Design an enzyme around this catalytic site. Structure first.
Site, short mmCIF file in Angstrom:
data_model
loop_
_atom_site.label_atom_id
_atom_site.label_comp_id
_atom_site.label_asym_id
_atom_site.label_seq_id
_atom_site.Cartn_x
_atom_site.Cartn_y
_atom_site.Cartn_z
N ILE A 34 0.83 -1.20 0.00
CA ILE A 34 0.00 0.00 0.00
C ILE A 34 0.87 1.26 0.00
CG2 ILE A 34 -1.52 1.44 1.43
CD1 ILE A 34 -2.92 -1.13 2.36
N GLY A 35 0.55 2.18 -0.90
CA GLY A 35 1.10 3.54 -0.87
C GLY A 35 2.46 3.71 -1.49
N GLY A 37 5.43 5.41 0.22
CA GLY A 37 6.49 5.17 1.21
C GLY A 37 6.62 6.30 2.21
N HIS A 38 5.63 7.20 2.20
CA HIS A 38 5.54 8.29 3.18
C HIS A 38 4.78 7.86 4.43
CE1 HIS A 38 7.60 11.25 0.79
NE2 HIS A 38 6.76 11.09 -0.22
N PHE A 39 4.29 6.62 4.42
CA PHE A 39 3.77 5.97 5.61
C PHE A 39 4.58 4.71 5.93
CE2 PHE A 39 0.40 8.83 6.34
CZ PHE A 39 -0.22 9.12 5.14
N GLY A 40 5.69 4.55 5.21
CA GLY A 40 6.61 3.43 5.43
C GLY A 40 6.22 2.19 4.67
N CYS A 41 6.56 1.03 5.23
CA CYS A 41 6.26 -0.26 4.63
C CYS A 41 4.86 -0.71 5.06
CB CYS A 41 7.32 -1.29 5.04
SG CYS A 41 7.16 -2.91 4.27
N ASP A 154 3.19 16.63 14.21
CA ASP A 154 3.44 16.52 12.77
C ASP A 154 2.17 16.72 11.94
OD1 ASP A 154 4.95 16.20 10.46
OD2 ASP A 154 5.11 14.02 10.63
N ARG A 158 -0.66 15.91 4.29
CA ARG A 158 -0.11 14.58 3.97
C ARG A 158 -0.38 13.54 5.06
NH1 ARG A 158 4.30 17.75 5.14
NH2 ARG A 158 5.29 17.24 7.15
N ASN A 159 -0.64 14.01 6.28
CA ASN A 159 -0.85 13.13 7.42
C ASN A 159 -2.32 12.93 7.78
OD1 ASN A 159 1.80 12.27 8.02
ND2 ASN A 159 2.25 14.18 9.10
N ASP A 172 -0.83 9.90 12.06
CA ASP A 172 0.60 10.12 12.32
C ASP A 172 0.92 11.03 13.50
OD1 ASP A 172 1.64 8.26 10.61
OD2 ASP A 172 2.30 9.69 9.08
C1 LIG Z 1 -4.76 3.81 -0.30
O1 LIG Z 1 -3.69 4.64 0.17
C2 LIG Z 1 -3.41 4.52 1.50
C3 LIG Z 1 -2.16 4.95 1.96
C4 LIG Z 1 -1.84 4.84 3.30
C5 LIG Z 1 -2.76 4.30 4.20
C6 LIG Z 1 -2.45 4.19 5.55
O2 LIG Z 1 -1.21 4.63 5.96
C7 LIG Z 1 -0.99 4.83 7.30
C8 LIG Z 1 -1.48 5.94 7.99
C9 LIG Z 1 -1.20 6.08 9.36
C10 LIG Z 1 -0.43 5.13 10.04
N1 LIG Z 1 -0.15 5.18 11.36
C11 LIG Z 1 -0.42 6.14 12.25
O3 LIG Z 1 -1.01 7.19 11.98
C12 LIG Z 1 0.00 5.80 13.69
C13 LIG Z 1 -0.29 6.46 14.88
C14 LIG Z 1 -1.08 7.77 15.03
N2 LIG Z 1 0.28 5.77 15.88
C15 LIG Z 1 0.19 6.11 17.33
C16 LIG Z 1 1.17 7.14 17.90
C17 LIG Z 1 0.83 7.42 19.37
O4 LIG Z 1 2.50 6.66 17.78
N3 LIG Z 1 0.85 4.75 15.42
C18 LIG Z 1 1.46 3.81 16.16
C19 LIG Z 1 0.62 2.85 16.75
C20 LIG Z 1 1.15 1.83 17.53
C21 LIG Z 1 2.53 1.77 17.73
C22 LIG Z 1 3.36 2.72 17.14
C23 LIG Z 1 2.84 3.75 16.35
C24 LIG Z 1 0.72 4.68 14.10
O5 LIG Z 1 1.18 3.82 13.35
C25 LIG Z 1 0.04 4.02 9.33
C26 LIG Z 1 -0.23 3.89 7.97
F1 LIG Z 1 0.23 2.83 7.28
C27 LIG Z 1 -3.40 3.66 6.42
C28 LIG Z 1 -4.64 3.25 5.92
N4 LIG Z 1 -4.92 3.36 4.62
C29 LIG Z 1 -4.02 3.88 3.75
C30 LIG Z 1 -4.34 3.98 2.40
#
Ligand SMILES: COc1ccc2c(Oc3ccc(NC(=O)c4c(C)n(C[C@@H](C)O)n(-c5ccccc5)c4=O)cc3F)ccnc2c1
Length: 281
Positions: A34-35, A37-41, A154, A158-159, A172
């Site tokens: 998915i995506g 790489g601005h949300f990683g892997c 942040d 984009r977030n 994010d």
């Molecule tokens: C179709 O196109 C896309 C492209 C990207 C997408 C997507 O990307 C992400 C968006 C957001 C996040 N993560 C976050 O926003 C997180 C937040 C807000 N926290 C929490 C914060 C307190 O750290 N944590 C987190 C939770 C547990 C442990 C460590 C960190 C997180 O991962 C991870 C993703 F892939 C998520 C869902 N649909 C997508 C569809």
């Protein structure tokens, strides 16, 4: 990645249990990405309930996590996010602690990806009311986060995510100098008040449909630019009252900036005066 999970605290593992999901309900499609790489892997995932009903999710692999301290921090973040519940804040479906492979984060699938890319896409036709509406939803999500004493750090277009019903989900939460408040650039400190400055920049992105802020200003020259009292120009499609809201968000004195509660009521009033929408939430 082989994390020695035995070296974790019993009370913390007990604390994180309500957040943990695994192979008995989650199917990760490691061959389906998915995506950009601005949300990683991120992988496509499927989550099943007790009767076998499927839910589309995104599965982020935290590949940079190695040591037990980083895992413990990961568990606590999971615990915090799981407790949040607001229609304008991205949900945490769960996390995966596995003996082989990186920790995983499971989020609901967001059909329309991130807000910046959505508004930049020329095949989409959001009205001024649409763009203000997106800004209002963000403000409501930030109003909730502020009420939980949680600082985003942040905030940017984009977030912010957009689902199939065009509901904005702030994501994010918890270097983008062009979104950072003056005091954050100087003293490196981040608060809800600095989140308000970033939100002002986010509103500017929306009204320009995702134009990069301060085009003619270098990233290192941004502190002097703001101390000179210069601000982002009023976007062509931005009304005067919304631009004044932006200016309030970028007040030199953090305490003088409006609260997200004040922002919701003010933007709601501006939003109500507008007509015509192609994206109804
Ligand atoms: C179709 O196109 C896309 C492209 C990207 C997408 C997507 O990307 C992400 C968006 C957001 C996040 N993560 C976050 O926003 C997180 C937040 C807000 N926290 C929490 C914060 C307190 O750290 N944590 C987190 C939770 C547990 C442990 C460590 C960190 C997180 O991962 C991870 C993703 F892939 C998520 C869902 N649909 C997508 C569809």
């Amino acid at each position: 990645v082989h994390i020695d999970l035995s070296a974790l605290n019993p009370e913390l593992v007990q604390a994180v249990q309500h957040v943990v999901i695994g192979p008995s309900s989650l199917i990760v499609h490691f061959n389906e990405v998915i995506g950009r790489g601005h949300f990683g892997c991120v992988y496509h995932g499927t989550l099943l309930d007790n009767d076998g009903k499927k839910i589309h999710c995104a599965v982020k692999s935290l590949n940079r996590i190695t040591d037990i301290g980083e895992v413990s921090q990961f568990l606590t973040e999971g615990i915090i996010m799981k407790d949040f519940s607001h229609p304008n804040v991205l949900s945490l479906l769960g996390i995966c602690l596995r003996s082989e492979g990186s920790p995983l984060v499971v989020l609901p699938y967001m059909k329309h990806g991130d807000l910046r890319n959505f508004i930049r896409n020329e095949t989409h036709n959001p009205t001024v009311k649409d763009l203000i509406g997106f800004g209002l939803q963000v403000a409501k999500g930030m109003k909730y986060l502020a009420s939980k004493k949680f600082v985003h750090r942040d905030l940017a277009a984009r977030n912010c995510m957009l689902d199939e019903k065009f509901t904005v989900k702030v994501a994010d939460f918890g270097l983008p100098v062009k979104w950072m408040a003056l005091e954050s650039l100087q003293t490196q400190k981040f608060t809800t008040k600095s989140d308000v400055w970033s939100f002002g920049v986010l509103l500017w992105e929306l009204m320009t449909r995702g134009a990069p802020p301060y085009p003619d200003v270098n990233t290192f020259d941004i502190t002097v630019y703001l101390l000179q009292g210069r601000r982002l120009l009023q976007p062509e499609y931005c009304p005067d009252p919304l631009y004044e809201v932006m200016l309030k968000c970028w007040h030199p004195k953090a305490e003088m900036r409006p609260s997200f509660s004040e922002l919701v009521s003010r933007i709601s009033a501006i939003f109500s005066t507008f007509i015509g929408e192609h994206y109804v939430h």
